[PDB]
Design a protein around this motif. Structure first.
Motif, PDB file in Angstrom:
ATOM      1  N   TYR A 403      68.044  -0.099   4.369  1.00 16.01           N
ATOM      2  CA  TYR A 403      68.165  -1.488   4.830  1.00 16.01           C
ATOM      3  C   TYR A 403      67.659  -2.311   3.614  1.00 16.01           C
ATOM      4  O   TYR A 403      68.269  -3.447   3.390  1.00 16.01           O
ATOM      5  CB  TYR A 403      67.312  -1.786   5.965  1.00 16.01           C
ATOM      6  N   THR A 407      69.947  -5.042   1.968  1.00 14.25           N
ATOM      7  CA  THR A 407      69.735  -6.555   2.053  1.00 14.25           C
ATOM      8  C   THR A 407      69.381  -7.289   0.732  1.00 14.25           C
ATOM      9  O   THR A 407      69.179  -8.400   0.655  1.00 14.25           O
ATOM     10  CB  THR A 407      68.793  -6.860   3.151  1.00 14.25           C
TER      11      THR A 407
ATOM     12  N   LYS B 162      65.481  -8.942   5.419  1.00 15.47           N
ATOM     13  CA  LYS B 162      66.472  -8.154   5.138  1.00 15.47           C
ATOM     14  C   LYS B 162      67.204  -7.596   6.431  1.00 15.47           C
ATOM     15  O   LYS B 162      68.406  -7.019   6.349  1.00 15.47           O
ATOM     16  CB  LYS B 162      65.800  -6.720   4.457  1.00 15.47           C
ATOM     17  N   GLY B 164      66.684  -5.429   8.133  1.00 12.09           N
ATOM     18  CA  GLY B 164      66.846  -3.868   8.118  1.00 12.09           C
ATOM     19  C   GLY B 164      65.653  -3.128   8.736  1.00 12.09           C
ATOM     20  O   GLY B 164      65.930  -1.862   9.017  1.00 12.09           O
ATOM     21  N   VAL B 165      64.393  -3.782   8.605  1.00 17.21           N
ATOM     22  CA  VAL B 165      63.213  -2.871   8.750  1.00 17.21           C
ATOM     23  C   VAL B 165      62.330  -3.941   9.551  1.00 17.21           C
ATOM     24  O   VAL B 165      62.329  -5.118   9.090  1.00 17.21           O
ATOM     25  CB  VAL B 165      62.635  -2.395   7.710  1.00 17.21           C
ATOM     26  N   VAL B 178      55.649   1.004  10.775  1.00 17.49           N
ATOM     27  CA  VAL B 178      56.990   0.377  10.249  1.00 17.49           C
ATOM     28  C   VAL B 178      58.146   1.093  10.848  1.00 17.49           C
ATOM     29  O   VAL B 178      58.154   2.500  11.264  1.00 17.49           O
ATOM     30  CB  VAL B 178      57.173   1.094   8.676  1.00 17.49           C
ATOM     31  N   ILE B 187      56.840   4.973  11.348  1.00 12.15           N
ATOM     32  CA  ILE B 187      56.411   5.623  10.225  1.00 12.15           C
ATOM     33  C   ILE B 187      54.890   4.821  10.302  1.00 12.15           C
ATOM     34  O   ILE B 187      54.476   3.649  10.437  1.00 12.15           O
ATOM     35  CB  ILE B 187      56.881   5.385   8.938  1.00 12.15           C
ATOM     36  N   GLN B 224      57.705  -3.197  -2.562  1.00 18.21           N
ATOM     37  CA  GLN B 224      58.279  -2.201  -3.320  1.00 18.21           C
ATOM     38  C   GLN B 224      58.238  -0.720  -2.991  1.00 18.21           C
ATOM     39  O   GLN B 224      58.857  -0.052  -2.214  1.00 18.21           O
ATOM     40  CB  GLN B 224      58.122  -2.526  -4.774  1.00 18.21           C
ATOM     41  N   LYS B 225      56.619  -0.249  -3.223  1.00 13.31           N
ATOM     42  CA  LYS B 225      56.460   0.903  -2.838  1.00 13.31           C
ATOM     43  C   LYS B 225      55.208   0.750  -1.923  1.00 13.31           C
ATOM     44  O   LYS B 225      54.469   1.569  -1.517  1.00 13.31           O
ATOM     45  CB  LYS B 225      56.120   2.063  -3.789  1.00 13.31           C
ATOM     46  N   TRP B 226      55.217  -0.530  -1.155  1.00 14.41           N
ATOM     47  CA  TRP B 226      54.167  -0.858  -0.279  1.00 14.41           C
ATOM     48  C   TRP B 226      52.706  -0.719  -0.874  1.00 14.41           C
ATOM     49  O   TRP B 226      51.822  -0.050  -0.324  1.00 14.41           O
ATOM     50  CB  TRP B 226      54.118  -0.099   0.924  1.00 14.41           C
ATOM     51  N   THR B 227      52.586  -1.461  -2.088  1.00 16.34           N
ATOM     52  CA  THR B 227      51.103  -1.286  -2.687  1.00 16.34           C
ATOM     53  C   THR B 227      50.244  -2.408  -1.810  1.00 16.34           C
ATOM     54  O   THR B 227      50.530  -3.165  -1.288  1.00 16.34           O
ATOM     55  CB  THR B 227      51.312  -1.878  -4.236  1.00 16.34           C
TER      56      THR B 227
END
Lengths: 431, 367, 296
Positions: A403, A407, B162, B164-165, B178, B187, B224-227
């Motif tokens: 997703y 997006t 987004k 999407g999440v 999440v 998650i 990005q990687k959840w920093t």
């Protein structure tokens, strides 16, 4: 070569952890000394005699023996640790796992070290238990405590080393683990003392025996917790090295090489971190390796991620084809979830950051896997009793990560070359 | 630094703020129609009057100051159209869309003690609703019940722009949730220290996530990687966090303090600068900036009032005192939201304690 | 077609892979059919697709090899190429076969809009309107002498004029020369031109048989390409199945008399029509192998 450096750093980290433990031993010895001779109406004399016996030669000898036992324990953590939990899927499997020659040897070692520690405590508990029926009973209690400690370390899999979800200063992690370790030692000592009393019945004293058992179990839990917290210390692997000589120590090789699995999980967490906050190492991941213009770093990283992912996909579609099976088919999905999240977010950012478009050259590729993987997952959720914790983690990371990528790409993804089957799901998710 | 002092004195007890005309808060007597050049464009967002006559974690941590007695329990404006959801007192979600007399109503068996509603962006058919024990994804058998054990009471849920999440939050769980709506999957993102996560706010473009805890530490999360960057230097808990329309300025306040801390997201600047001193005034309970980045509504609870300010982004980001928005006698501003897509300026929908939701336009009248 | 192509891929010969893919691509009273205006339009648009994709693949390959100089970014690809290499953008775009990128490019530097769409995409059926007379006029007036090679080439392409100009300043590969002259298309005239005026030696087929083939077959000269490649030894079997495909396809023109030479043009045919004795072909072909592989 990387095996030697990893093993040396591991022995030295065992050194750091067992070093915190060896520094912490003597204060515990003094605490036990003051507690075993608690004179409530004579505190000054009890404390002074406990200080004199704390300087007595026998006390130093007992401390040395306990330190040797703790060193044996640290080597045990170094020898029989695990980076994947030990799961008995059947009770007969558990009984078999407790019957191994090496595990029986470890249990015997624990019983013997516990007997030694109990004897040391009895000699430190100056009184009728100094020379060899009460002293024999205390020794038997120590041996049973050691055996039970080995058995419990096997059942609760305390030999599993949990990678910290949040990295913290070792002092803070130790302080946090302190109360749980202490309460656990107390409760386990009480329960094991009750069981040992019943056993001795079948085939002053109670307070001292409980004190000795509590002290021994606390030392064991502290050794285990320190060995964990320090041997699990995160190390950053240099992404690309100014020399090919450190090329084996770079995260790409160490991740693609057959080094010990501990280093693999460590480099996995490390790369997740670097992709989370380290922008420079990220640019180096998209670096064009000269000569050849090849993004070798990103190539190997994504290759490993997708290899593990396709493996987990095969495993899910397989074990699906019952509840334990569909629970185990995705037990290894933690790494896959981490990789999916990191990778798809890196793509989502590539629409702005990778000024060379180095990621675009594989863009379509990734899409396929996702759709493909997603498809399998749906069929996975199709088998009954499978839709009723790495599995949900991978599912969520996949859906969310796709997703995010979608997006972020927005409309320019409509230009991406994709299989029409993947395209339908693409439209669905973007919708 | 902006003070509450330079604002034009609030509208007197008899006047209601009608609209923002030429940077001056125009007062109305409840029947002075907006200038006829503006009355033929008042897109009829519902002005519903819901009579009230028709937990403790959730209450103390909700967005509303009066969640226990306000029939308006939560508000949400869809990112794209004039579609907005209002949470009734009985946990029954109503969905009012401008230009429709139909009232979409959603009430699941899980709908108890609703905390927040989030219109999933880029989609007019998904509404995430935070319930007591789970998240009801209302597909506007139409409710997907998403549950992650321990992530209850659910207090803060936000769908990524987004679409999407969707993130969910729990003041008792140390790991934020999440949620992937299609996989029905949850998650856990674990964090050491600070207690549960009570309020989540992802940045306008999707990089930074301001996460406030019932403790005194607030964290920035790079998506990005959840920093995780911890800012454990707040004298108390974070009351609210407002992201710039651009997402490089995060406005926050520490409940108990009456200051607007402006964290410039230029690895953010390791300290916060005081930008608007809302010292009485009183407790800064809520803050909201119009998507254009020119108008900002800050809810000050002592009659609770909306300090409306015009912000200048260049050459120095500063808060300028513009005026006070108030309700009628006895009407305490319970919730407020700037409609994301008012094409002719700014649309601020304010929900008051009686349940009456009014719309105030800030007219960007070009000189 | 599919059977042969799968055979070819397994055969591992590059040129044959190319030619067979082209055979497929180009393939999607046979004499009457070969000459029908719709049929010509189809064969052409097909070869145009083939060449478009070809040069676009060339673009992909060159950019991916010259990343460092490319500054590729994450319209773009053509800019990247132009670095390695307004009229220039559209030219190099169309020669990579993506007319829509050049469309965006013309959109940025833009009654003329309806006209432009009419030129590229919009059908633009109009009543008593005059088209392509005005363009050629100005082009001859001003553009014909312009100092912008790309611009004059684009004018030639749009208005179907100045067919004499190789415009080789911006057209260097036979690929281009085709693409352009095609885009300017009376089919038999160019047919003779390439077949007769240019002839073999110009195409230097000795190294590039596949080329001279592509040249013929793209222009719907099926009998030619067949015959030519037939003269080649290594190509024999190929053309055979090729011919066979055309035969059942109702797409091959046979010669009527047995003793005719392998290629024949019969009287009264629309010019450029040729016939080949599919029988005499297969006979002479198999003859070499009948004594050995009877079942064949």
């Amino acid at each position: 070569m990387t095996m030697l450096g990893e093993r040396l750093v591991l022995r030295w980290r065992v050194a750091a952890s067992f070093a915190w433990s060896v520094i912490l031993m003597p204060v515990c010895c003094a605490l036990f000394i003051v507690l075993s001779r608690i004179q409530i109406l004579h505190p000054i004399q009890w404390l002074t005699d406990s200080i004199s016996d704390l300087t007595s030669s026998y006390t130093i000898f007992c401390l040395l023996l306990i330190c040797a036992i703790l060193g044996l324990q640290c080597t045990f953590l170094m020898e029989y640790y695990t980076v994947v939990p030990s799961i008995p899927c059947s009770r007969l499997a558990l009984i078999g796992n407790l019957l191994l020659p090496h595990r029986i040897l470890h249990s015997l070692a624990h019983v013997a070290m516990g007997v030694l520690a109990s004897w040391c405590y009895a000699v430190l508990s100056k009184g009728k238990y100094q020379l060899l029926e009460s002293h024999l009973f205390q020794l038997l209690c120590g041996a049973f405590f050691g055996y039970s400690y080995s058995l419990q370390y096997f059942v609760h899999n305390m030999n599993y080393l949990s990678f910290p979800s949040i990295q913290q200063y070792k002092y803070l992690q130790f302080r946090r683990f302190l109360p749980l370790i202490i309460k656990q030692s107390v409760f386990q000592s009480l329960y094991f003392i009750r069981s040992y009393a019943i056993l001795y019945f079948c085939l002053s004293l109670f307070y001292q025996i409980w004190l000795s058992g509590t002290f021994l179990l606390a030392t064991w839990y502290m050794v285990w917790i320190l060995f964990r917290i320090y041997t699990t210390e995160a190390r950053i692997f240099p992404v690309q090295t100014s020399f090919a000589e450190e090329a084996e120590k770079c995260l790409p090789f160490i991740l693609n090489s057959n080094t010990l699995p501990l280093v693999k999980y460590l480099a996995m967490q490390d790369l997740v971190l670097l992709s989370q906050y380290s922008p420079s190492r990220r640019q180096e991941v998209f670096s064009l390796s000269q000569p050849g213009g090849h993004p070798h770093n990103w190539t190997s990283i994504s290759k490993e991620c997708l290899n593990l992912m396709s493996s987990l996909t095969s495993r899910l579609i397989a074990h699906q084809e019952p509840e334990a099976s569909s629970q185990d088919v995705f037990a290894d999905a933690q790494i896959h979830i981490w990789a999916l999240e990191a990778l798809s977010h890196l793509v989502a950012a590539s629409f702005s950051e990778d000024r060379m478009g180095v990621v675009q050259t594989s863009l379509s590729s990734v899409l396929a896997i996702l759709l493909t993987l997603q498809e399998a997952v749906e069929k996975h959720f199709k088998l009954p009793h499978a839709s009723s914790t790495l599995r949900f983690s991978l599912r969520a990371a996949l859906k969310t990560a796709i997703y995010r990528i979608t997006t972020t790409f927005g409309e320019h993804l409509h230009a991406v070359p994709v299989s029409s089957e993947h395209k339908k799901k693409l439209q669905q998710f973007l919708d | 630094m902006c003070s509450l002092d330079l604002f034009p004195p609030p509208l007197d007890g008899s006047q209601l703020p009608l609209y923002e005309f030429n940077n001056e808060i125009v007062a109305g007597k409840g029947f002075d129609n907006p200038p006829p050049t503006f009355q033929s464009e008042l897109v009829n967002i519902p002005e519903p009057t819901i009579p009230v006559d028709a937990e403790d974690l959730t209450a103390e941590f909700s967005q509303a100051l009066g969640w226990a007695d306000c029939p308006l329990r939560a508000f949400a404006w869809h990112p794209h159209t004039y579609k907005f959801a209002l949470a009734l007192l009985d946990d029954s979600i109503r969905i009012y869309t401008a230009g429709s007399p139909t009232i979409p109503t959603l009430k699941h068996r899980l709908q108890k003690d609703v905390a927040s509603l989030a219109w999933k962006p880029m989609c007019a058919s998904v509404l995430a609703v935070a319930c007591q024990s789970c998240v009801l994804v209302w597909h506007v058998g139409c409710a997907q019940v998403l549950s992650h054990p321990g992530h209850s009471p659910v207090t803060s849920v936000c769908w990524s722009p987004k679409g999407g999440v969707l993130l969910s939050a729990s003041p008792v769980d140390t790991a934020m949730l999440v949620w992937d709506v299609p996989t029905e999957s949850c998650i856990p993102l674990q964090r050491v220290g600070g207690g549960g996560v009570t309020f989540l706010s992802w940045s306008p473009d999707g990089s930074k996530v301001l996460a406030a805890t019932p403790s005194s530490v607030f964290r920035v999360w790079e998506t990005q990687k959840w920093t995780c960057e911890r800012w454990p230097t707040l004298q108390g808990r974070c009351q609210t966090g407002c992201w710039s329309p651009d997402g490089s300025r995060l406005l926050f306040a520490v409940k108990g303090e009456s200051v607007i801390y402006s964290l410039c997201f230029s690895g953010g600047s390791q300290s916060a600068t005081v930008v608007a001193d809302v010292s009485e005034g009183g407790e800064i309970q809520s803050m909201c900036w119009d998507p254009s980045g020119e108008r900002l509504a800050v809810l000050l609870k002592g009659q609770p009032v909306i300090a409306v300010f015009r912000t200048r982004n260049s050459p120095i980001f500063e808060l300028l005192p513009c005026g006070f928005i108030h309700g009628r006698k006895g009407e305490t501003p319970q919730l407020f939201q700037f409609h994301p897509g008012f094409n002719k300026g700014a649309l601020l929908s304010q929900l008051w304690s009686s349940g009456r939701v009014n719309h105030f336009p800030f007219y960007f009248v070009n000189a | 077609v599919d059977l042969c192509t799968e055979a070819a891929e397994r055969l591992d010969d590059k040129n044959v892979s190319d030619l067979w893919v082209m055979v497929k691509q180009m393939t999607d009273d046979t004499l009457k059919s070969r000459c029908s205006g719709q049929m010509q339009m189809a064969f052409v648009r097909q070869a145009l697709n083939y060449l478009e994709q070809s040069y676009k693949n060339y673009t992909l390959i060159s950019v991916f090899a010259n990343l460092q100089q490319a500054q590729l970014g994450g319209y773009n690809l053509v800019r990247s190429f132009l670095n390695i290499r307004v009229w220039a953008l559209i030219y190099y775009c169309m020669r990579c076969g993506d007319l829509m990128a050049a469309q965006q490019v013309v959109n940025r530097a833009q009654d003329f809009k309806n006209c432009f769409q009419e030129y590229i995409h919009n059908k633009d059926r109009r009543l008593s309107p005059t088209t392509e007379n005005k363009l050629r006029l100005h082009y001859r007036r001003a553009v014909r002498a312009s100092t912008d090679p790309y611009k004059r080439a684009v004018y030639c392409i749009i208005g179907r004029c100045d067919v004499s100009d190789n415009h080789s300043e911006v057209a260097d590969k036979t690929e281009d020369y085709l693409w352009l002259k095609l885009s300017q298309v009376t089919l038999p005239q160019f047919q003779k031109q390439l077949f007769e005026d240019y002839g073999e030696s110009h195409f230097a087929v000795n190294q590039q048989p596949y080329l001279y083939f592509q040249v013929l077959f793209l222009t719907a000269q099926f009998e030619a390409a067949i015959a030519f490649l037939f003269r080649l030894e290594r190509t024999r079997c190929h053309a055979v199945h090729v011919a066979l495909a055309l035969f059942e396809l109702k797409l091959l023109l046979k010669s009527t008399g047995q003793s005719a030479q392998l290629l024949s043009q019969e009287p009264g045919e629309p010019q450029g029509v040729r016939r080949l004795n599919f029988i005499r072909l297969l006979m002479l072909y198999t003859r070499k192998f009948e004594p050995t592989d009877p079942r064949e």
